[PDB]
Structure 1
Amino acid sequence: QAITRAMADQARTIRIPVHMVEVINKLGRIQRELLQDLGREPTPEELAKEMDITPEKVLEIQQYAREPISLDQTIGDEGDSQLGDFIE
């Protein structure tokens, strides 16, 4: 319990409430189970059927789950300049 609560409260650059992290992890887990079972990836409507909630909220959860990237990671094929040198 302590480890999972701390993961939810501290693992992400943008804090996500545990009530939303739980649904994100559950969605990912059962979606990978569905992919393994069915042989293809599950579509958002199919995943919403298991979430017992609407595909709009499924998509909102999906776009919420994304994490930021570093402004200083090298973007070029070689190491020449940082991503921060491309942002207006």
Structure 2
Amino acid sequence: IETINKLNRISRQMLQEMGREPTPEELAERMLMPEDKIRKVLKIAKEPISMETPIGDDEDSHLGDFIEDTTLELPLDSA
């Protein structure tokens, strides 16, 4: 979290100085860490996304309906 504080502080100084989007090499340097950390944190900032949301604009498809389950078996494989 302290690292992430440093980054979401330093990124903004960066886009000031830049004035346009810091895709992670126009971000990484001033952060003081290489590209891969900024990128990794850019991935991990996804809190999960709550099945009970209506991905259908209508009350037609809560995400739970779309989910497929690839764990048990397929009967042709048993055969």
Q: By the TM > 0.5 criterion, same fold?
A: yes
Secondary structure of 2:50's partner? coil
Change (3 A) 1:32 1:52: closer
Q: Percent identity?
A: 56
Once the two structures are superposed, what CA deviation does each residue of 1:9-47 show, in whole Å capped at 9, x if it has no partner?
Answer: xxxxxxxxxxxx222233123223432443211121132
Q: 1:60 is matched with which residue? A: 40
Unaligned residue ranges in structure 1 (runs of 5+)? 1-20
Unaligned runs of 5+ in 2: 69-79
Alignment of 1:60-79 (within 5 A): 60-79=40-59
More helix by share: 1
CA distance in structure 1 between the aligned counterparts of 2:14 and 2:52, rounded to whole angstroms? 37
After superposition, residues 17-56 of structure 1 pair within 5 angstroms as 21-56=1-36
Give the total of aligned pairs: 68
Cα contact 1:24–1:65 (8 A) shared by 2: no
TM-score by length of 2: 0.68
TM-score (norm 1): 0.63
CA distances 1:29-74 after superposition (whole Å, capped 9, x unpaired) = 3223432443211121132111212101221121122211011111
Quote the RMSD (CA, aligned, Å).
1.8
2:71 — aligned with what? none
Residue 62 of structure 2 corresponds to 82
